[PDB]
Amino acid sequence: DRPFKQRRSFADRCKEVQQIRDQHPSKIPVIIERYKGEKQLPVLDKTKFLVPDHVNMSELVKIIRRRLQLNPTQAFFLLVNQHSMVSVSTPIADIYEQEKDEDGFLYMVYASQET
């Protein structure tokens, strides 16, 4: 259950982004993890997503919500560096250039609170 950055070294994370640049150049490499203090939402099956660079962030919110199989009642937020991405109808390619990690991944966190 450890976070991605505790399972992979910085150099290995950089090499993985570089490999994705070669093999899936039109995809943004995204890490999506459950907030550490999250109580209500389940853990997602997978952590690493290759997102076509034209996808709007607001659509990624809907996709992850569907993957979690929640009621329309359960609150859900997907955050990039504590910015909620529910209303961001901007392609991920633009968010990437602005919010990417030094290792080249784009890190997101989901929670039942937007704090």
Ligand SMILES: O=C(O)Cc1c[nH]c2ccc(F)cc12
């Ligand atoms: O969910 C995934 O597996 C990765 C992903 C996120 N958004 C997408 C949009 C189109 C597509 F082909 C794949 C994706």
